[PDB]
C-alpha cells in the first residue's frame, strides 16, 4: 500500500528533477549551425541471390566484408567491392532475425525464433564454415546480438531478459532483468563498457557490463521501441520506435534532447544508424524509403528510394564510406 | 584487368550462385503450414498422426507434396511482434478441443476456454498480416465431447444456445460460430474437420485444403480470378 504509492512519488520526484536541470531547448541551441542541405546518395552495388526476406546485416571493421541474414536459411558474407560472395553458411533453423560479425572477423553469430545463438568460425583449417558454439537457455526469441569481443557476446531475447555470454565456456556470466516489455535491439558503444537496449515497454535502459545492473532508464516514446543506435562519442543514442518518431537521449543529461518526426509519415522505424562524424541520422521507414536526417538541424537531408518492400535493416560502415540497406525484396543495395 | 586471384574469387561466387538457385527451387515446392491453438488442444497428438524450446518443425510428404509444419506454442513472448515473419504462409492449422467448454481456465479468473479460444481465433483471422491466408480448423476430442454433452448441457456456459441436446446439433453450432468470427468471407476460406482416432482421415483433409490454396494462388497468377 504505502510502498506502491512511494514509487509514484519517486517517479514524480525524478520527473521534477529532470525538468529542474533543463534550461535551454536543444533546437534553440542548434539554430546557429547552418543546414547541411540536400544530400543525394547514388546506388553503387546491387547484391543478389538471397531469394528470400532479408532481416539483418552487419558491417565488418575492415569496411569491405558484410554478413546478411535471409529467411531461406542462408548467411551470406559479401565482398562489397567486387560483388563476389565470400561465404554461404547453411542454417539449421530458417527463422533468423539477427546476425553479428566479429570485430576481428573470426566469428559470425545468428539467432531467431529457435532460441539458439549459433557461432560460426570462419578461419578453420578444414575450409568449411562449421558450427563452433551453440548458446541455449533463452525462453524468448532472440532479436539482436553483437560481439563485444571474440569470447564475449551480449544477446537480446523475447523473454524480457538480456545476458552476457562467454563463448568458450558456453554459459551465461551476467544476466540482466527488469524489462517489462520484450527487448528488440541493442547497440554497442565504442569503448564497449556499456550498452543500451530498447524494449516494448516504451523504455530504453542503459546497461553496464562490469556492474551488471541498470545505470539509467529513459521513457520518452509513446508505444514501443524497434531500434536503438549509439552515437560515435558514446554519450548519446538515437532511438527508433513504432510511433513514427525518433528521439535522442543523452546519458549525462539524463533527459530527452530532441524528437525527430514529420506529419505525413505514420509508419514505424525498423533500424537506425550513424555516420562516422555522427552528423547524419539514417533511418529506414516502412514507406519503402530510407530517410537521411540531420541530428542537429532535425530536418530531412535526403531520401533513399529504390527498395520494393519494407527496409528491414540499415548499417553504416566503420570508416563511413558507404551505407548498405537491407529490405524484404531480397536485394542488398549499397548507397554512397 | 582482374588479377589471377580475383578471377578465381569470381568463380567461387558463381559456384555459390548455382547452389542458392538450386536451394531456392527446392524451397519453393515445399508447402509451409502454421500451427496454432492452445497447449491442451492436442497439438502433439495430431502431429504424431500425420507423421505416422522454440520452433517445432515437422516434415512429412503426402502425395509427392512437401509439408513444413511450424509449432509456435512453446514461446511465451508477445505474439504481435514476431507474427509478421509468417506472412508468406499457405494455410494456418488452428487446433482446439471441443470438450474445453466445461474446463474453466487455469487462471483464477472465471473464463470459459471456448471463449478464450474464440479470442484466439479472432485475433489471427482479423490480423492484418493474414488477409488472404486460409485457416484449416481442427476440432479435437469429439468423442469426449459426445459423452460430456450427454451429461452436461451447453446452455450453462452461455444462455444464447437454446437448441435441443444433440451431438450433431451441438457440434454444428460450435462450427458455425467459428465461421461467423470471420470478417472477410470472400477472400478467406475456413476448412473445418472433426478430428478422430483414425489417422488416415486427418492427413487427407490437409491435402485437400492445401490443393485449393495452390489452385487459388495459380488462378491469381494467371489473372483469371
Amino acid at each position, epitope marked *: 500500500d504505502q510502498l506502491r504509492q512511494e514509487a509514484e512519488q519517486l517517479k514524480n520526484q525524478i520527473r521534477d528533477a529532470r525538468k529542474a536541470c533543463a534550461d535551454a531547448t536543444l533546437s534553440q541551441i542548434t539554430n546557429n549551425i547552418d543546414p547541411v542541405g540536400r544530400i543525394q546518395m547514388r546506388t553503387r552495388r546491387t547484391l543478389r541471390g538471397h531469394l528470400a526476406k532479408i532481416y539483418a546485416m552487419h558491417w565488418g571493421t575492415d569496411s569491405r*566484408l558484410l554478413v546478411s541474414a535471409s529467411q531461406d536459411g542462408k548467411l551470406i558474407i559479401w565482398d562489397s567491392y567486387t560483388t563476389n560472395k565470400v561465404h554461404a553458411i547453411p542454417l539449421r533453423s530458417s527463422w533468423v532475425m539477427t546476425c553479428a560479425y566479429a570485430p576481428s572477423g573470426n566469428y559470425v553469430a545468428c539467432g531467431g525464433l529457435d532460441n539458439i545463438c549459433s557461432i560460426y568460425n570462419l578461419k578453420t583449417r578444414e575450409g568449411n564454415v562449421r558450427v563452433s558454439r551453440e548458446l541455449a537457455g533463452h525462453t524468448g526469441y532472440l532479436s539482436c546480438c553483437r560481439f563485444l569481443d571474440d569470447n564475449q557476446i551480449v544477446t537480446s531475447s523475447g523473454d524480457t531478459t538480456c545476458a552476457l555470454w562467454d563463448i568458450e565456456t558456453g554459459q551465461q556470466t551476467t544476466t540482466f532483468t527488469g524489462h517489462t516489455g520484450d527487448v528488440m535491439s541493442l547497440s554497442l558503444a565504442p569503448d564497449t563498457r556499456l550498452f543500451v537496449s530498447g524494449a516494448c515497454d516504451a523504455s530504453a535502459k542503459l546497461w553496464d557490463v562490469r556492474e551488471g545492473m541498470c545505470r539509467q532508464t529513459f521513457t520518452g516514446h509513446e508505444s514501443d521501441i524497434n531500434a536503438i543506435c549509439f552515437f560515435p562519442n558514446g554519450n548519446a543514442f538515437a532511438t527508433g520506435s513504432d510511433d513514427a518518431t525518433c528521439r535522442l537521449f543523452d546519458l549525462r543529461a539524463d533527459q530527452e534532447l530532441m524528437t525527430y518526426s514529420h506529419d505525413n509519415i505514420i509508419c514505424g522505424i525498423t533500424s537506425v544508424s550513424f555516420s562516422k562524424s555522427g552528423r547524419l541520422l539514417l533511418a529506414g521507414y516502412d514507406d519503402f524509403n530510407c530517410n537521411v536526417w540531420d541530428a542537429l538541424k532535425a530536418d530531412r537531408a535526403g531520401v533513399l528510394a529504390g527498395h520494393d518492400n519494407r527496409v528491414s535493416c540499415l548499417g553504416v560502415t566503420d570508416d563511413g564510406m558507404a551505407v548498405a540497406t537491407g529490405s524484404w525484396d531480397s536485394f542488398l543495395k549499397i548507397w554512397n | 584487368t582482374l588479377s589471377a586471384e580475383d578471377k578465381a574469387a569470381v568463380e567461387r561466387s558463381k559456384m555459390i550462385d548455382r547452389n542458392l538457385r538450386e536451394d531456392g527451387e527446392k524451397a519453393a515446392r515445399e508447402v509451409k503450414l502454421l500451427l496454432l491453438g492452445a497447449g491442451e488442444s492436442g497439438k502433439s497428438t495430431i502431429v504424431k498422426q500425420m507423421k505416422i524450446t522454440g520452433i517445432v518443425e515437422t516434415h512429412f510428404t503426402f502425395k509427392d507434396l512437401h509439408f513444413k509444419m511450424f509449432d509456435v506454442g512453446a514461446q511465451r513472448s508477445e505474439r504481435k511482434k514476431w507474427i509478421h515473419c509468417f506472412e508468406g504462409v499457405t494455410a494456418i492449422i488452428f487446433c482446439v478441443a471441443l470438450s474445453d467448454y466445461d474446463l474453466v481456465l487455469a487462471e483464477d479468473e472465471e473464463m470459459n476456454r471456448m471463449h478464450e479460444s474464440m479470442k484466439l481465433f479472432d485475433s489471427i483471422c482479423n490480423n492484418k498480416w493474414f488477409t488472404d491466408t486460409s485457416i484449416i480448423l481442427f476440432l479435437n476430442k469429439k468423442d469426449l465431447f459426445e459423452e460430456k454433452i450427454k451429461k452436461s448441457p451447453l446452455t450453462i456456459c452461455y444462455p444464447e444456445y437454446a437448441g435441443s441436446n444433440t451431438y450433431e446439433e451441438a457440434a454444428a453450432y460450435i462450427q458455425c460460430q467459428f465461421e461467423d468470427l470471420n470478417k472477410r468471407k470472400d477472400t478467406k476460406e475456413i476448412y473445418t474437420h472433426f478430428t478422430c482416432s483414425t489417422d488416415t482421415k486427418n492427413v487427407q483433409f490437409v491435402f485437400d485444403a492445401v490443393t485449393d490454396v495452390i489452385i487459388k494462388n495459380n488462378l491469381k497468377d494467371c489473372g483469371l480470378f
Partner: single-chain antibody
Framework: VQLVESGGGLVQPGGSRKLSCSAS????????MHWVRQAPEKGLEWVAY????????YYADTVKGRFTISRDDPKNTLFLQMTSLRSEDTAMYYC??????????????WGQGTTLTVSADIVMTQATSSVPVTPGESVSISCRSS???????????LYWFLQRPGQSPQLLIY???NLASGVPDRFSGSGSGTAFTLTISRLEAEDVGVYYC?????????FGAGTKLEL
C-alpha cells in the same frame, strides 16, 4: 587435414603413370589443387592447377599437353595423368590445396611428396644463393621480379615459402602484408614493386632451410631459385 601421394617408383621413358592423392579431414570439393615438382639439386617448380568444380584448368608452358589433371569429388581423390614422360621429369611431386577469396591464405598446406625417377613470363630472380648466419642476428633475404607485382586492386602477389630439410615446405608469409596461420611473429616482409625484402628477427635452429619467393600474378607460375641458410 592431411595429404598423401601414391604411385611412385621408377618409370621407363615414353611410358605412362597415373598418380592419386587422397584427402582426409577437410572439404576436398572446395579447394583448388596445385602440383609442384622439385628437382633433386634445384629449386621447386609449378606443374598444374585445377579449380574447384573443374571450371578452369591451367598448365605451365613446358608441360602443356603431356600432363592431364582431373579430380573426383565423391571419392575425394586427385588424379594426375602422365603421358610420354621425358628425362626432365625426374622430380618429386607435391599436392597443394589453395582456397581463393578475400582474406584467404592459399598455398598453406603442402603434401608429403611422391618420388618419380626416370632413367634414359615473369622471371623471379634470387640474387644471392647462400648466406652463412649465426643464431640471434637479423637475417636479410632479397628477391626480385621481372614485372611489377603491385596490381591495381592494391594486393602484391608475393608468397614466401620455407622448405625445412627432410620435411614438406610450409607457407610463411602470404601477399607480404599478412602472416600465415601457425607462423610466429619472427618473420616480417617489406619492400615495394620489383624489390622485396625478408627479415628474420631472433633466428632459431628450426628456421634454417631453403627460402622461396613465388609470384602469383598470372599463369604460368614461376618460382625463385631458392636462398639456403646455414650455420
Amino acid at each position: 587435414v592431411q595429404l598423401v601421394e601414391s604411385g611412385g617408383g621408377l618409370v621407363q621413358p615414353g611410358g605412362s603413370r597415373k598418380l592419386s592423392c587422397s584427402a582426409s579431414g577437410f572439404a576436398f570439393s572446395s579447394f583448388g589443387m596445385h602440383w609442384v615438382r622439385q628437382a633433386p639439386e634445384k629449386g621447386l617448380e609449378w606443374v598444374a592447377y585445377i579449380s574447384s568444380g573443374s571450371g578452369t584448368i591451367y598448365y605451365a608452358d613446358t608441360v602443356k599437353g603431356r600432363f592431364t589433371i582431373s579430380r573426383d569429388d565423391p571419392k575425394n581423390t586427385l588424379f594426375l595423368q602422365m603421358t610420354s614422360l621425358r628425362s626432365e621429369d625426374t622430380a618429386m611431386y607435391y599436392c597443394v590445396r589453395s582456397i581463393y577469396y578475400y582474406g584467404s591464405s592459399p598455398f598453406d598446406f603442402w603434401g608429403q611428396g611422391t618420388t618419380l625417377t626416370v632413367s634414359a613470363d615473369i622471371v623471379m630472380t634470387q640474387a644471392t644463393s647462400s648466406v652463412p648466419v649465426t643464431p640471434g642476428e637479423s637475417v636479410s633475404i632479397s628477391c626480385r621480379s621481372s614485372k611489377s607485382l603491385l596490381h591495381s586492386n592494391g594486393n602484391t602477389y608475393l608468397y614466401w615459402f620455407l622448405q625445412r630439410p627432410g620435411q614438406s615446405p610450409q607457407l610463411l608469409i602470404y601477399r607480404m602484408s599478412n602472416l600465415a596461420s601457425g607462423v610466429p611473429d619472427r618473420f616480417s616482409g617489406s619492400g615495394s614493386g620489383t624489390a622485396f625484402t625478408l627479415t628474420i628477427s631472433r633466428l632459431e635452429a628450426e628456421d634454417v632451410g631453403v627460402y622461396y619467393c613465388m609470384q602469383h600474378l598470372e599463369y604460368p607460375l614461376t618460382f625463385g631459385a631458392g636462398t639456403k641458410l646455414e650455420l
